[PDB]
Structure formats: C-alpha cells, structure tokens
C-alpha cells in the first residue's frame, strides 16, 4: 500500500531506531522525519502534538527547514489506488494544512521575521488545487491576510503633581494608587506580549536573545529597572525622616499591587526591600508602623521555598492578574538540564511546553483601568543606572547605604532634607 523510501522518505516503518513512545499514543523521542509523519498522521488527529510541536520545534528544527519538510511530506508520489488516495493521500494532506492553520494563527512571528519563509508558504498554499482542501486553503489565506494587516474604569487619582505636569512626576509627588495602576497596566502588556517560544531551549540566555526572545528580555529588564529605581529612591534619600516616608510609600504601592493581583510588582518591591543596601537600614524600618511591617512580611513569605506560597495564591485568584516570570524560568532551566536532549528527546520539549502554558493562561484578560500616557511614559523613561553598568551601580547603592546609615562603630549622622513638598501620604483607598 505504502510507497518506497526513494520516492517517499516517510516510508520507513516505526522501529526502535525511529519514534519511541511511552506507556498507555504519546511520543517520547524519534527522528524529525518521524516527528513530521506522526504530526500529520492519517489514522487520527492529534491536536496536543500540533500545539506542543509548533511551540517547541525551533529547539530541534529550523523554520526554513520545517516548511521544506511539511511540503516534502505533502507532495506524496484501482482496488488499492483509489484507496491509497483516500486512506493516505487525502488525510495526510488535510493534516499538513491543519498544521499550517495552527502555524500562521498562533506562530505568525516566524513569518514576520523571515519574509522569504512567508513567501514560500503563500506559494505552497496557492499550489494546493485539491477539492476537499478548499475550505482549509480559504482559512489559511484568510488568516495570512488578517495577520499582515494587523464596565467603566475608575477615576485617575492625583496627589501633588497636577495632571499634565510630567516634569514634577516622582514617587512621592504622584499618587501611590495611580503609580501601581499604571505600572500594573504597563507590566500586564509586557506580560501579555511574551510568546511561549521565547522560553523554549533557554533562547533568552544564548547568542541571538534579542531577536528570538524580544518580549521576554523587555519584561526582564523592566523588572530590573523598577527594582533598582526603588532601591535608588531609598538610599539617595539621606534624611532619615524623609527615607521613612519613601519606604512607607513603596509599601503602600505594594498594597495596591496586591489588590490588583500584580505579583510581578509585589515581588519587585520585595526584591528591592531584600536587596543588600535596603535590608540593612535598621534605623529606617523602626519608624515604619507595624501595619506596614506585616504587609511586607506576608509578601516576602510568597518567595519562601520555591515561591510555593505564591503558587498557591496564584491558583486561587481570577483573570485580572500579572504572574511572576522568575519561578517559571527557574523550573524550565532545571527541566531543560535534567532531561537530556537526545535518546531526539521530545518529552523534554513537551515538559518545557507544559511549563509555558501554566504562565500563559493569564495572557488574555485585561485590566479595567484607564491608561495615563504621561504617567506611563514617565515609568517607561526610567533609567536608574544611567551610564554606569549593572555591577557598578549596585556597588554605588550599597556604598550609599553604608553612608546614610553607617555600621555599628560609627554613629548616625543627620542629613538635610531634599524634598520641599509635604511628605504625608494621601492614602491607599480610591
Ligand atoms: C519585613 C521586611 C522588613 C521590615 N520591617 C525590611 C526588609 C525586608 C522585609 C521583607 C521583604 N523581607 C523579609 N521578611 N521576613 C523575613 C523573615 C526575611 C528573612 N530573610 C530575608 N532575606 C533578605 C535577603 O537576604 C537574605 C535574608 C528577608 C526577610
């Protein structure tokens, strides 16, 4: 029934040297030729294989090479001749177009990063002149052209800085309710923009990390800037009574971060408070009320163990949420290092793809908050390091900490004020 190997490379049957399954199918390993064959199997459909493959195929196959394989598998060279066209030719051709649907619909970034890859896809779909494959070709063409063309929020809160005067925006001049709202809207968009393929194969820690993981790095370096900006506002406020107001305001921003389920912002404040320059400021935290001490304690307990307390709280809240990327990136690297690579190992890619879907399920629901473009651009313009590098700026923050609160033998100096506006916080309630 089946052709030969010279005419069709997908003719060699399954054996121990190609395709390896698990216990009861679910594929564990195999060659790329066999991975495409089972991805387009004629006896049944497998949507779980398609979604996991197209998400993790770039870890073992290249996009230009994948298109050449699905086209090679598509172009297959009368008691059985009419049956072979219905039991093998027609169903396999439908499975190839099904992958093409899922490829352009959910992984279109591969095409807008390689124009030659998209041109070949449009030429292949144009050559498909079947009869039953018409509705699939129509759907593929519609998705391609669509991709190429591609209640009431509450009142915005203001404190000292009047609206429109972006030149006076600061941590104490802006309302802490609005600081967390805009940072939540800012971080939510940075989270929703991350594609799962940017986490497969540790591509964000390799050579081409900018073009393969453009959205993940932008999410990471934003967390670094806002954390360092929190630490910079604290240590550079030499006045003790003024630094207490700075830290207390960041605790109030954590309160709103918790009301909006922005766990990235909560742990950004946590990471800034646990940093070496901020954690040793014993004189500052003594004047912080016990109510704000408990809030920082509970937020830190989310980081104990492997964020297991954060995971438990995440599984008990609802849509409007901004997850934390760190705990998932850690579990991916240990899995991508624990499991090997070849036995090629596909259960490793599946195990990594299972982790991506856990943090991806919150990438749909938006926040019922109105965007403030001036406040948004202010936080987008944040660059606390400046010209200095990462290690040189963190060493400055700690030396600034050893200066504003010298260690045990030295006394505690008194420093002049730096903020001329009132320091009383407006409030945490809308
Ligand atoms: C509550 C608070 C305050 C005050 N007041 C002031 C600052 C921070 C915090 C939180 C956010 N950090 C922590 N909280 N509770 C424990 C039991 C912690 C135990 N260990 C740490 N680590 C910090 C990093 O180096 C290793 C030790 C942090 C803890």
Numbering used by the authors: 568 to 591, 599 to 651, 671 to 743, 756 to 948, 956 to 1042
The authors write:
SOS1 is one of the major guanine nucleotide exchange factors that regulates the ability of KRAS to cycle through its “on” and “off” states. One of the major regulators of this process is the Son of Sevenless (SOS) protein, a guanine nucleotide exchange factor (GEF) that acts as a key activator for KRAS function. The binding between KRAS and SOS proteins helps facilitate the turnover of GDP-loaded KRAS into its GTP-loaded state. Additionally, functional genomic screens have identified that several cancer cell lines addicted to KRAS signaling are particularly sensitive to genetic perturbation of SOS1.15 Functionally, KRAS mutations lead to a reduction in GTPase activity, resulting in a higher population of GTP-bound KRAS and increased RAS-pathway signaling. GTP-bound KRAS also binds to an allosteric site on SOS1, leading to an increase in SOS1 GEF activity, thereby ensuring a high population of active KRAS. Herein, we report the design of a new class of phthalazine-based SOS1 binders that effectively disrupt the SOS1:KRAS protein–protein interaction.
Pushing out from the 3-position of the phenyl ring with a bromo substituent was well tolerated for SOS1 binding, and further introduction of the 3-cyano substituent resulted in the highly potent inhibitor of the SOS1:KRAS PPI, MRTX0902 (32), with a reduced lipophilicity (cLogP = 3.4). Based on the pKa of MRTX0902 (measured pKa = 6.7, ∼17% ionized at pH 7.4), the phthalazine is not highly protonated under physiological conditions; however, the local acidic environment of the protein likely helps drive protonation of the phthalazine core. The structure further revealed that the newly installed 3-cyano substituent on the phenyl ring presumably enhances the edge-to-face interaction with Phe890 due to the electron-withdrawing nature of the 3-cyano substituent. The substituted phenyl ring also provides shape complementary with the back pocket of SOS1, although the cyano substituent creates no discernible interactions with the protein as captured in the static structure. The SAR of the benzyl amine modifications show that the 3-cyano substituent in 32 provided the most effective combination of potency and lipophilicity and led to a nearly 6-fold decrease in CYP3A4 inhibition (IC50 = 3.6 μM) when compared to that of the 3-trifluoromethyl-substituted phenyl 24. Furthermore, the co-crystal structure of MRTX0902 (32) suggested that the C6-position on the phthalazine could be used to further tune the electronics of the core structure. Further in vitro profiling showed that MRTX0902 (32) was highly selective for SOS1 when compared to SOS2 and showed no inhibition of EGFR. X-ray co-crystal structures of these inhibitors reveal a unique salt bridge between the phthalazine core and Glu902 of SOS1 that has not been reported with previous SOS1 binders.
